[PDB]
């Protein structure tokens, strides 16, 4: 959320999805860098998980119609969505300290797991996957 | 051919005619680095960064020739990357790297320090594993 | 490991992708033999493995071997005796019944202790994803849900769970392959689907295995299968642990910039359809361990009049977190949380299922009586025995060569010594 | 070949205080020692001892600049407390392939506080329940281990 | 060649046995001989259905207007087959067909369904109107046996009471339980007074605050 | 830290700790092979413990017979089958006196049930030994074959329908000089099959008529075949054993000592009540001791003659015909002949050969060619061996066939309660193999004197207590049939757990069967709430895998999953969708007895309700509880061979192979171009050739001359 606020890529869907989790006191790594996740699991296991990148049964977003699906219930978010929100699609609000810089480049290699992302060094560019068929290229940032 | 095949063939071409390259190294001229065999090698290095690799390799090889003694494995490892023209830093110094990524990413990477999936020389027995294949250097 | 989005794909494609990622191992053609079995031929096994990898890396949808030569000649499938009419055997004088190869007698194996120690550890990955249940209303449902929550949280990432999932999945695939292909060789990768804490899920490949033909339609008929599994442990360290394995050295992986070798343990084996069913049912270890834990909790609650689940797991104001004696450290007793006890119970159940033979079940059935007598002694009930040596002979009749039985006997002796030395206080 | 030959080759017959690293590999030793390294050494940063058949650590120059040391493929089994009295400035420790029986062997490393990475591969101590956790709470100063403290970085 | 096959068929027809077998035996009967020639029965029902489902058309289908109502193909997915079957003497349908019927099939009338299966609905109603009590562990009625799985165990006992058409004290029967929950929420939290009053003020029995009902 | 699982016992009572040690209540696959060697050993041991009895030659079957009853009493602690008749009669007298009007009522009820029963009851059973073919066949098939043979032999008991006429016809068939019957004979094959030559060899069965002399049928009826049951009995014995076991069950039901047919928590109640009752009447200041006794060679020592005596004593006041009916079973068992199975296998390593020696040729080779154990076993079995590969076996019980009567005998042994009027009183429980004995006395010395007296008494009745598997301890903690009781707490040693996979009927039926199985496991075997919920989870996972009906909102892909996803998208009441349609599962403990349709009815979409419960849908067409909807489909169940006579005579004519060869080319050139649906293959060929000629001419492969020639030939066919 802080990274989104600093550099204006404010996305309503990501903000709503990740706001509730912000309560608990922060628990950073020994390096002082925040952890990284792909999906946040909740109690009850199985379906009870929120996907950080694409969408989960408990939370999904349809930008074509701008419809929010929460636990199988559909709502319309008209008036709470900016025109430029769609263009900054997803890649700037999925990891801490990472921002989008390009597109899929098979030359750079295949998609990099969170294990390699966490051990990466600033100024190095990597490739990630949002969901099937929508890869993206990101770069680490000091801020 | 695949990237692994190209690396294997380039390193084998280097190994077979070792005498020529090792003799040209002492003279210290760019003619040896501008060999045809490395042109295909130039295809398996990222275009946006191959020049930095070439500059770093040239700098380390110059230091090798100047301020130390023979080290066959490192010379072997760092020779092929110098075909492309260098891109020095803004100040004028060469860029420093320790992991030379290759086309395909992931496993397709060379390690400057000791060895990698493609290149790894053990001195304890003096055996060079190249692309999952062991040569002897005795 | 090969990170994937989470889609379901055929095992052949998964194995092909996994080998592509680790291309160096796939393209290995010169084997550095490290150890050899007494009878197996290293050349035949290596050529069979090469054929298996070639079939995996090809493009045809089927996972069927086409170079049947080495497969046929490697598993000793051509050395079977030919059956002749009974009349000739009656007339013949050289045809005589063969003596039974009674199991040998073996001493304590040090690797079973390491197996138990490691399989009870918590790794970084979990392989259990069970469906959901309806909302809980009745108090009994709430108690059961709390027990399930604690159990899964404790043994979600336990290495035993991943090993159990690999075992059951491999046996299920073996059984499925026997659907219509019985007279043909089938290549089957030993794959697994795993999930880590961060949420990203991986598709692991543990090796391959080629299953031969079973012309006979019987279900209790052995169909020879030879399995090549990857490993990172040099067999020379424990030569006695692998007298039955043929091991090569394929290549070397890099995890943190450091080279670690990779060996390929190749072994011939024989199992029948009923053994496939047993392996498939081997998932019952989860229910077994849960029932054991629930019996412990029920006893603890029966001491009182109210449920003791949270108190014995986390501890309430009145009570304290229950601690169980886990094992020994430098010859001294060591305690641990109920979670460690649950993990040890699960590992013990899994090992019991995996190492199960008539010797194991007989030994367990008789150690039941011995343990009950020991318990009666503990509670000052003044037990009496009529023929003690009969019980001891019945128990010792089953300790011949099973690793699990021998290690269980060793642990029983150690615990009996501990009880003796602790009962004098 | 002997430790003396390796010392001569590396030093090239120069003053002892001219090299900050040593490579004593594939060298036969008398009764499993590391002779050939006199106490006169004052500056040293990296060490490498592999296949030397070292059985104990009792002969080592006192040092205050070493940060890395490498021992592997040895049958050494004894207390390492002497390192504190000899060089309490170690940061990288490598015991891969050594022969250590139980947890008590690695106890004396508590008094050392500068150690950040310790390596123990295929060791008899490594095959135990909660060995990773037990070692961690036994050596709080440790910041790295066989490679998976929390992430993967290279020495 | 058509002519070669024609002449061979005529030559075969010259013989009586071939002509008879070709005239009587049908194309359907032709498959049967191959089956027993290279197929037989299996066992292990659990796995049998697993194999059957993966097939194309494992499900039997009835003959009628409804059967033909569902299509042959759907979004590139086959549903049933046109040619008659031998065993069932009718069409065969794929598993997906069932799902199609559940999605875009004709909508029938289910009025009076509860009456037909009234016993199950009575059981469900009795379960819904239950009033669960306490659970007590070891010491150290027609409507009760049905739920016995959830009442009594080896070392535990669940206090459960039945129900059935006990309507009339609706509002009261509501408020009490609601009030109970409030206490259950307040006793655990520190300083239960303010939290309890807050929850009691902000609770509505579907039209009105709890205060009015109390 | 070296783990030691046994250390758990330090912190937990062993009774709870070893709970559910064996997940399987059935049989493992690795159990010691039960082949010819095992049955030979069983018969050897059965005759060994009774070798001091009277040995004679049966005048009916001409087989060696051993009768240990009323034989010399044992002089050693080894197992003994010498059960004195007087002791058994006295024990029955004591039981009858203690329970007045029990034997008479039980016999009356058994005879009434027999009168009202029907032959169909015999079809409820495991594999039965069919004598017509001499194999193991399902109960229904064996009964049908026996009925057909009886009809061929002018015996029509099944026609009357009652069981009494059926058994009368059985005992009459035991008197016919010659018995004719049907049998199945396999003959090799010569019909074509495309592997590489259009020719394959197999086996085809045919029905034939075979006759057997009187003695042969007598021996066959008494035969016991082997497949922890060791053998199975044919149909000639099933009715009588059924009646006798019904009688024994009627007696046992009212015996407080009997541990059967209790099932569920009632077992725990009986255990605790027995313990409490024994402790209550303990002498003031006395001692109560408990023995978890076990019986060795239980069924290898009980004698059918003793069972005959028990049946005669019980039915002492009953109609003579019913007395004979009850007695027919013990006498049949007293003459049982065991079948040794397949045989042995002998190999020659030098020439790489092996062969199978069948039972009739067991002794056809010198004994020196058998290994030591088989050599000794055959040497000992020689006297009790018949030339037809069968072994005479008078004593023994070959595992469970009179389990209820065994329990009755054990209860009789437990009912004496005193010997010599000493200062001890014993009682307890027994269920057909295992007994728990409680003895109250003054001091432990007198309790052990009473235990010794009980041991001697049961020895007199032929029951052999296991000294090597029994122990005694102060009352309050013991075991009874894999159920450990300890001061109120109760635990199970082995509990059956749900097996992988669905029941195997259909979606709704499989779900209902799984849920009812979980409910029954909870009720009977005592599965805890958490274990039952985990079983529900596992069953749901297996069900979804088998039926490919993952959640509608999941991201899995499949042929059925696309329609499931579309339905999930179009549906409003997503909580009401069935699991089979990718909906959410809602099953839990409180609702394990309610069909999911009934559970979700209130939440279903009315349109979805109509589609699902359409009164006339094409799937349903024409225990457990479910709802008849579109998910109750039926799978194609039609295989094997019908029209056997016509197909066999067609295949035996000659020209079938040529017809197949002509069919193959044309109808395999394309994957499927067959106008199937009862079309005559000649008609289909005519149409196929007509279309082929049309296409050839249209594309130009044939000229007009060939076209017209082909149409003329096809004109002669009759379909043009």
Author numbering:
A (entry chain F): 601 to 743
B (entry chain C): 541 to 678
C (entry chain D): 292 to 716
D (entry chain G): 1 to 155
E (entry chain F): 1 to 140, 227 to 300
F (entry chain E): 1 to 227, 239 to 633, 655 to 752
Mind quoting what the paper says about this structure?
In the nucleus of the infected cell, influenza polymerase (FluPol) uses the viral genomic RNA (vRNA) as template to perform synthesis of either capped and polyadenylated viral mRNA (transcription), or unmodified anti-genomic copies (complementary or cRNA), which then serve as the template for vRNA synthesis (replication). ANP32 is required for both vRNA to cRNA and cRNA to vRNA replication. First, it stabilises the formation of the replication complex, an asymmetric FluPol dimer comprising a replicase, which is part of a parental RNP and synthesises the genome copy and an encapsidase, a newly synthesised apo-FluPol, which binds the 5’ end of the nascent RNA replicate to nucleate formation of a progeny RNP.
Further refinement focussed on the replicase or hANP32A-encapsidase moieties improved the map quality and estimated resolution to 3.3 Å, enabling relatively complete models to be built. The encapsidase moiety of the FluB replication complex adopts a very similar conformation to that seen in the apo-FluPolB symmetrical dimer. The PA-ENDO(E) is rotated by ~48° away from the PB2-CBD(E) compared to FluPolA, so there is no longer contact with the PA-ENDO(E) 63-73 loop as observed in FluPolA encapsidase. In addition, the lid domain of PB2(E) is also disordered in FluPolB encapsidase, although there is some suggestive, but low resolution, density close to the PA-ENDO(E). Human ANP32A binds in the same position and orientation to the FluPolB encapsidase as in its FluPolA counterpart, but due to sequence divergence the interactions are not necessarily conserved. The total buried solvent accessible surface upon hANP32A binding to the FluB replication complex is ~2200 Å2, only 66% of that for the FluA replication complex. In both complexes, the main anchor point remains the C-terminal end of the LRR domain wedged against the PA-C(E) domain in the vicinity of the N-terminus of PB1(E). A critical contact is again made by hANP32A 129-ND, but in the FluB replication complex it is D130 that directly interacts with the Pol II pS5 CTD binding residue PA(E)/K631 (in FluA replication complex, N129 contacts the equivalent PA(E)/K635), with also a slightly more distant salt-bridge to R634, whereas N129 hydrogen bonds to PA(E)/S411. Furthermore, the PA-C(E) 550-loop of FluPolB, being four residues shorter than that of FluPolA, does not reach so far onto the β-sheet surface of hANP32A. Additional pseudo-continuous density is present in the FluB replication complex maps that we interpret as tracing the path of the hANP32A LCAR extending beyond residue 155, the last of the folded part of the LRR domain, and wrapping around the encapsidase.
